[PDB]
Amino acid sequence: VLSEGEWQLVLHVWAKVEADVAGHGQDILIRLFKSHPETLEKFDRFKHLKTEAEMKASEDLKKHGVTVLTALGAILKKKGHHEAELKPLAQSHATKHKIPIKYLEFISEAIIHVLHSRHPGDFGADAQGAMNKALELFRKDIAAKYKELGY
Ligand code: HEM
């Protein structure tokens, strides 16, 4: 469980993210797709993209980054009490989109990297550690729902 001090670190950097949700979502998805090309393939919307420049030029990719980061921000602000927010997400991701937990680990890495690049002064090691714990908690809870569903 995260402590109150850890949640404060998480939400302090997250408030910086929310000044530019779309730009952060672009950066995160591009990093994910470049670092882990199998993830791109899960998106019929995006698997035509062949280059970073094409990814950066795609308005639809920017829209999905907003969708993803909006959902994550709503989860983070629940400070662990995110059961209702995870139910639909775990269901769609296990049974429709088919996103392994490992791919959630990869996007978590991408989130952390982009937050460190964009917000170094608010993303020292303490805050990195807290955000890693928050994203682990997310993954843990989704994983339990996947297991229930046999995914
Ligand atoms: C922080 C982690 C993530 C969050 C919060 C998140 C959130 C969302 C949301 C809110 C939606 C739309 C509602 C829904 O279908 O449930 C969605 C759709 C989707 N997401 Fe996730 N997502 C995350 C990670 C990923 C990863 C890592 C992948 C792939 C590697 C992925 C693949 C997809 C796909 C394929 C869709 C459907 C897109 C479409 O065809 O419109 N997501 N996601």
mmCIF file of C-alpha atoms and ligand atoms in Angstrom:
data_model
loop_
_atom_site.group_PDB
_atom_site.id
_atom_site.type_symbol
_atom_site.label_atom_id
_atom_site.label_comp_id
_atom_site.label_asym_id
_atom_site.label_seq_id
_atom_site.Cartn_x
_atom_site.Cartn_y
_atom_site.Cartn_z
ATOM 1 C CA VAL A 1 0.000 0.000 0.000
ATOM 2 C CA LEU A 2 1.180 3.511 -0.744
ATOM 3 C CA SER A 3 1.595 5.915 2.178
ATOM 4 C CA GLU A 4 0.029 9.359 2.126
ATOM 5 C CA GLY A 5 3.473 10.825 1.459
ATOM 6 C CA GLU A 6 3.930 8.550 -1.528
ATOM 7 C CA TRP A 7 0.509 9.474 -2.917
ATOM 8 C CA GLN A 8 1.410 13.166 -2.526
ATOM 9 C CA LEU A 9 4.545 12.632 -4.630
ATOM 10 C CA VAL A 10 2.526 10.801 -7.282
ATOM 11 C CA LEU A 11 -0.220 13.382 -7.507
ATOM 12 C CA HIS A 12 2.153 16.329 -7.409
ATOM 13 C CA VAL A 13 3.833 15.186 -10.613
ATOM 14 C CA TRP A 14 0.477 14.088 -12.057
ATOM 15 C CA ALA A 15 -0.871 17.630 -11.707
ATOM 16 C CA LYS A 16 2.038 18.681 -13.981
ATOM 17 C CA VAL A 17 0.978 15.997 -16.508
ATOM 18 C CA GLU A 18 -2.523 17.381 -16.541
ATOM 19 C CA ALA A 19 -1.303 20.706 -17.845
ATOM 20 C CA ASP A 20 -0.552 18.913 -21.152
ATOM 21 C CA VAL A 21 -2.400 15.616 -21.214
ATOM 22 C CA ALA A 22 -2.244 15.218 -25.003
ATOM 23 C CA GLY A 23 1.481 15.897 -25.329
ATOM 24 C CA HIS A 24 2.306 13.484 -22.530
ATOM 25 C CA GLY A 25 0.077 10.803 -24.077
ATOM 26 C CA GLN A 26 1.840 11.192 -27.409
ATOM 27 C CA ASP A 27 5.241 10.925 -25.865
ATOM 28 C CA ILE A 28 4.254 7.890 -23.798
ATOM 29 C CA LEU A 29 2.611 5.913 -26.602
ATOM 30 C CA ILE A 30 5.461 6.668 -29.018
ATOM 31 C CA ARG A 31 7.995 5.496 -26.483
ATOM 32 C CA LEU A 32 5.943 2.338 -25.863
ATOM 33 C CA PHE A 33 5.537 1.590 -29.580
ATOM 34 C CA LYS A 34 9.207 2.199 -30.363
ATOM 35 C CA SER A 35 10.555 0.295 -27.386
ATOM 36 C CA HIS A 36 8.092 -2.588 -27.654
ATOM 37 C CA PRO A 37 6.779 -2.989 -31.221
ATOM 38 C CA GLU A 38 4.471 -5.864 -30.302
ATOM 39 C CA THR A 39 2.340 -3.284 -28.530
ATOM 40 C CA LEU A 40 1.697 -1.308 -31.701
ATOM 41 C CA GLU A 41 0.347 -4.445 -33.326
ATOM 42 C CA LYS A 42 -2.495 -4.587 -30.763
ATOM 43 C CA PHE A 43 -3.973 -1.406 -32.293
ATOM 44 C CA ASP A 44 -5.813 -1.759 -35.548
ATOM 45 C CA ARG A 45 -5.981 2.147 -35.313
ATOM 46 C CA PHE A 46 -2.194 2.443 -35.336
ATOM 47 C CA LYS A 47 -0.470 -0.522 -36.860
ATOM 48 C CA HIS A 48 -0.109 1.325 -40.206
ATOM 49 C CA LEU A 49 2.380 3.671 -38.561
ATOM 50 C CA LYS A 50 5.950 2.788 -39.600
ATOM 51 C CA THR A 51 8.085 5.699 -38.338
ATOM 52 C CA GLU A 52 8.330 7.923 -35.289
ATOM 53 C CA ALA A 53 7.510 10.955 -37.425
ATOM 54 C CA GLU A 54 4.332 9.235 -38.621
ATOM 55 C CA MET A 55 3.414 8.447 -35.018
ATOM 56 C CA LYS A 56 4.032 12.092 -34.024
ATOM 57 C CA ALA A 57 1.814 13.270 -36.910
ATOM 58 C CA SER A 58 -1.174 11.059 -36.058
ATOM 59 C CA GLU A 59 -4.052 12.960 -34.467
ATOM 60 C CA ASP A 60 -5.820 9.713 -33.660
ATOM 61 C CA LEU A 61 -2.766 8.513 -31.703
ATOM 62 C CA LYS A 62 -2.882 11.796 -29.726
ATOM 63 C CA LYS A 63 -6.606 11.172 -29.037
ATOM 64 C CA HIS A 64 -5.883 7.697 -27.657
ATOM 65 C CA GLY A 65 -3.090 9.084 -25.478
ATOM 66 C CA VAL A 66 -5.674 11.388 -23.947
ATOM 67 C CA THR A 67 -8.070 8.469 -23.424
ATOM 68 C CA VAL A 68 -5.375 6.394 -21.694
ATOM 69 C CA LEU A 69 -3.991 9.182 -19.502
ATOM 70 C CA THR A 70 -7.488 10.431 -18.559
ATOM 71 C CA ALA A 71 -8.357 6.965 -17.233
ATOM 72 C CA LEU A 72 -5.033 6.673 -15.412
ATOM 73 C CA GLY A 73 -5.407 10.071 -13.793
ATOM 74 C CA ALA A 74 -8.890 9.140 -12.506
ATOM 75 C CA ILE A 75 -7.406 5.914 -11.011
ATOM 76 C CA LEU A 76 -4.438 7.666 -9.422
ATOM 77 C CA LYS A 77 -6.612 10.285 -7.718
ATOM 78 C CA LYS A 78 -8.508 7.455 -5.984
ATOM 79 C CA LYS A 79 -5.243 6.682 -4.106
ATOM 80 C CA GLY A 80 -5.801 2.931 -4.271
ATOM 81 C CA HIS A 81 -9.572 2.986 -3.936
ATOM 82 C CA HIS A 82 -10.004 2.318 -7.632
ATOM 83 C CA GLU A 83 -12.119 -0.798 -7.777
ATOM 84 C CA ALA A 84 -14.934 0.689 -9.800
ATOM 85 C CA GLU A 85 -12.558 2.311 -12.270
ATOM 86 C CA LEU A 86 -10.615 -0.900 -12.857
ATOM 87 C CA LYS A 87 -13.590 -3.172 -13.497
ATOM 88 C CA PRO A 88 -14.439 -2.060 -17.012
ATOM 89 C CA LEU A 89 -10.815 -1.561 -17.900
ATOM 90 C CA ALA A 90 -9.672 -4.984 -16.773
ATOM 91 C CA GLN A 91 -12.637 -6.552 -18.553
ATOM 92 C CA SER A 92 -12.009 -4.837 -21.895
ATOM 93 C CA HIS A 93 -8.292 -5.368 -21.728
ATOM 94 C CA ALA A 94 -8.493 -9.051 -20.865
ATOM 95 C CA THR A 95 -11.353 -10.073 -23.099
ATOM 96 C CA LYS A 96 -11.441 -7.654 -26.079
ATOM 97 C CA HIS A 97 -8.156 -5.871 -26.498
ATOM 98 C CA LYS A 98 -6.078 -8.779 -25.171
ATOM 99 C CA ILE A 99 -3.352 -6.768 -23.449
ATOM 100 C CA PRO A 100 -0.968 -8.873 -21.372
ATOM 101 C CA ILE A 101 0.048 -7.603 -17.937
ATOM 102 C CA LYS A 102 3.586 -7.468 -19.332
ATOM 103 C CA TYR A 103 2.407 -4.769 -21.780
ATOM 104 C CA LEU A 104 1.081 -2.779 -18.797
ATOM 105 C CA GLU A 105 4.570 -3.069 -17.329
ATOM 106 C CA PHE A 106 5.976 -1.647 -20.573
ATOM 107 C CA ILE A 107 3.588 1.356 -20.602
ATOM 108 C CA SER A 108 4.445 1.947 -16.957
ATOM 109 C CA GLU A 109 8.108 2.165 -17.921
ATOM 110 C CA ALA A 110 7.228 4.619 -20.664
ATOM 111 C CA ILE A 111 5.160 6.760 -18.254
ATOM 112 C CA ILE A 112 8.016 6.902 -15.789
ATOM 113 C CA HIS A 113 10.550 7.777 -18.482
ATOM 114 C CA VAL A 114 8.422 10.608 -19.923
ATOM 115 C CA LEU A 115 7.611 12.050 -16.481
ATOM 116 C CA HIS A 116 11.330 12.083 -15.667
ATOM 117 C CA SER A 117 12.131 13.852 -18.976
ATOM 118 C CA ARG A 118 9.359 16.434 -18.661
ATOM 119 C CA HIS A 119 9.373 17.065 -14.889
ATOM 120 C CA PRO A 120 12.828 16.378 -13.435
ATOM 121 C CA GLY A 121 12.449 18.836 -10.566
ATOM 122 C CA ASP A 122 9.203 17.100 -9.481
ATOM 123 C CA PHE A 123 10.363 13.600 -10.322
ATOM 124 C CA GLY A 124 13.423 12.929 -8.209
ATOM 125 C CA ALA A 125 14.052 9.416 -6.986
ATOM 126 C CA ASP A 126 11.530 9.636 -4.215
ATOM 127 C CA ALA A 127 8.772 10.533 -6.661
ATOM 128 C CA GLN A 128 10.008 7.913 -9.169
ATOM 129 C CA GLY A 129 9.767 5.290 -6.504
ATOM 130 C CA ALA A 130 6.290 6.365 -5.444
ATOM 131 C CA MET A 131 5.037 6.415 -9.047
ATOM 132 C CA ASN A 132 6.517 2.989 -9.650
ATOM 133 C CA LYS A 133 4.571 1.759 -6.561
ATOM 134 C CA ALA A 134 1.339 3.337 -7.825
ATOM 135 C CA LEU A 135 1.725 1.734 -11.222
ATOM 136 C CA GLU A 136 2.607 -1.609 -9.582
ATOM 137 C CA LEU A 137 -0.590 -1.378 -7.551
ATOM 138 C CA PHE A 138 -2.526 -0.758 -10.777
ATOM 139 C CA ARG A 139 -0.946 -3.770 -12.397
ATOM 140 C CA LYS A 140 -1.464 -5.996 -9.344
ATOM 141 C CA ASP A 141 -5.130 -5.224 -9.235
ATOM 142 C CA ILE A 142 -5.685 -5.664 -12.941
ATOM 143 C CA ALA A 143 -3.728 -8.951 -12.784
ATOM 144 C CA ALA A 144 -6.077 -10.330 -10.149
ATOM 145 C CA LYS A 145 -9.047 -9.621 -12.414
ATOM 146 C CA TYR A 146 -7.235 -11.160 -15.401
ATOM 147 C CA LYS A 147 -6.609 -14.303 -13.340
ATOM 148 C CA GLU A 148 -10.240 -14.565 -12.454
ATOM 149 C CA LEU A 149 -11.171 -14.338 -16.126
ATOM 150 C CA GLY A 150 -8.587 -16.933 -17.169
ATOM 151 C CA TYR A 151 -6.405 -14.423 -19.028
HETATM 152 C C1 HEM B 1 -1.968 2.938 -18.085
HETATM 153 C C2 HEM B 1 -2.409 1.902 -18.777
HETATM 154 C C3 HEM B 1 -3.634 1.921 -19.629
HETATM 155 C C4 HEM B 1 -4.780 2.585 -19.450
HETATM 156 C C5 HEM B 1 -5.233 3.394 -18.260
HETATM 157 C C6 HEM B 1 -5.660 2.348 -20.610
HETATM 158 C C7 HEM B 1 -6.902 2.875 -20.797
HETATM 159 C C8 HEM B 1 -7.730 2.660 -21.907
HETATM 160 C C9 HEM B 1 -9.021 3.215 -22.112
HETATM 161 C C10 HEM B 1 -9.677 4.168 -21.114
HETATM 162 C C11 HEM B 1 -9.522 2.723 -23.225
HETATM 163 C C12 HEM B 1 -10.919 2.926 -23.799
HETATM 164 C C13 HEM B 1 -11.989 2.161 -22.997
HETATM 165 C C14 HEM B 1 -11.797 0.678 -23.053
HETATM 166 O O1 HEM B 1 -11.745 0.068 -24.147
HETATM 167 O O2 HEM B 1 -11.672 0.030 -21.976
HETATM 168 C C15 HEM B 1 -8.488 1.848 -23.803
HETATM 169 C C16 HEM B 1 -8.523 1.225 -25.052
HETATM 170 C C17 HEM B 1 -7.540 0.441 -25.633
HETATM 171 N N1 HEM B 1 -6.355 0.233 -25.056
HETATM 172 FE FE1 HEM B 1 -5.782 0.553 -23.098
HETATM 173 N N2 HEM B 1 -4.958 1.529 -21.466
HETATM 174 C C18 HEM B 1 -3.752 1.272 -20.922
HETATM 175 C C19 HEM B 1 -2.748 0.467 -21.477
HETATM 176 C C20 HEM B 1 -2.795 -0.175 -22.776
HETATM 177 C C21 HEM B 1 -1.687 -0.916 -23.371
HETATM 178 C C22 HEM B 1 -0.317 -1.029 -22.731
HETATM 179 C C23 HEM B 1 -2.167 -1.311 -24.589
HETATM 180 C C24 HEM B 1 -1.417 -2.036 -25.674
HETATM 181 C C25 HEM B 1 -0.225 -2.487 -25.620
HETATM 182 C C26 HEM B 1 -3.538 -0.924 -24.734
HETATM 183 C C27 HEM B 1 -4.379 -1.179 -25.746
HETATM 184 C C28 HEM B 1 -5.665 -0.674 -25.953
HETATM 185 C C29 HEM B 1 -6.504 -0.888 -27.085
HETATM 186 C C30 HEM B 1 -6.167 -1.759 -28.275
HETATM 187 C C31 HEM B 1 -7.643 -0.193 -26.904
HETATM 188 C C32 HEM B 1 -8.815 -0.081 -27.915
HETATM 189 C C33 HEM B 1 -8.507 1.067 -28.927
HETATM 190 C C34 HEM B 1 -9.538 1.195 -30.014
HETATM 191 O O3 HEM B 1 -9.565 0.349 -30.902
HETATM 192 O O4 HEM B 1 -10.274 2.189 -29.903
HETATM 193 N N3 HEM B 1 -3.927 -0.191 -23.544
HETATM 194 N N4 HEM B 1 -7.434 1.865 -22.982
#
